[model samples]
Target: SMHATRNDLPSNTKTTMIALLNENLAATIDLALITKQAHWNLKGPQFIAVHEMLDGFRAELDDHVDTIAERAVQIGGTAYGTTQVVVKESRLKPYPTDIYAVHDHLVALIERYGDVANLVRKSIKDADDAGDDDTADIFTAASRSLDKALWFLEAHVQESN
Candidate 1:
């Protein structure tokens, strides 16, 4: 129910920006929590390394979540960062609960990161088209971070038959 003060972006564009950001915020929250789940439960020879790596990923995801939430507020919208809203809005696939192996955890992490990265990439264009260059830049940074994390996770799975 916040009133728009910027006035440069039309009301409709602000609405679009809020919707775009909230959806991705939800995904980012889910991704970080799932990464933490792997960090806590992963087992195998690579357990220590993978566990520490997920910590770094979670930290970056926390930054991503903050940036997106701030952008929403900057545009006169409430940040929907509550656990209930995130659980209901997140589009990322459910984290697998049956596996504890490092390789399996890596596979799930890669898939989830890829899903979020793909969405972020699309959001970059959405924000730009909505006339919000700053939000687009935020998504651009998010895409880069997601790509790096995805690369780290993918390297653990790459091998010849």
Candidate 2:
């Protein structure tokens, strides 16, 4: 457990929320790293633009990671943010190591962002159901950002032929 805080929620409620937030923290951090992987290694004529765009996505995910980790602490639990914990607990699919093309990176990012967006969206409901409106609101904020990011990535792939 992380250092104790004075939060008034029941121990069980705080415990459950902490667990959920920590899992999401891991997923959010993994998403940021995978976005960076694409940002650094992508190769194509569109490289510069996609690279810049992915950097923004990575930064946004980093912010969400902080939010989730802090929320866990606020609820009086240790934030399990170590790489080993993230690797073991994250629900996101592993990024493909072979991806190098800009189009391929965009495809992977769209799917990844879409998955997390849905996960966060669902989490809003879960948090609310668990009597944690603050967590639900945080998930709501993340979901909107993810939807916008997904739109940007998907726009690159959408075409008329």
Q: Which runs in model 2 stand beyond 4 Å of their true positions?
A: none
lDDT tens per residue, model 2, 121-145: 8888888888988998988888888
lDDT values, one for every candidate: 0.90, 0.85
Which window of 10 residues has the lowest lDDT sum in candidate 2? 1-10
If scored against the real structure, what TM-score would every candidate get? 0.95, 0.93
Model 1 residue runs over 4 Å out of place are: none
Highest-lDDT candidate: 1
Quick one: best TM-score, which candidate? Answer: 1
